[PDB]
Amino acid sequence: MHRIWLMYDPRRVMVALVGFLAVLALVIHFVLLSSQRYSWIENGTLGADQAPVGASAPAA
């Protein structure tokens, strides 16, 4: 599996990796921060019984 470093230049696979992880981490944090259930900056101190849960309309 170490032959990866013969196929590809490790100096720049590793830049691509760190770039990919940084983008991915930021996307996930901004997604969660957009949600209602996981807006931790404003509702982070609520316990799970208080935390929002999304549902569809009751469809009576």
Partner: peptide, 4 residues
Amino acid sequence: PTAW
């Protein structure tokens, strides 16, 4: 029907 506004809520469950």
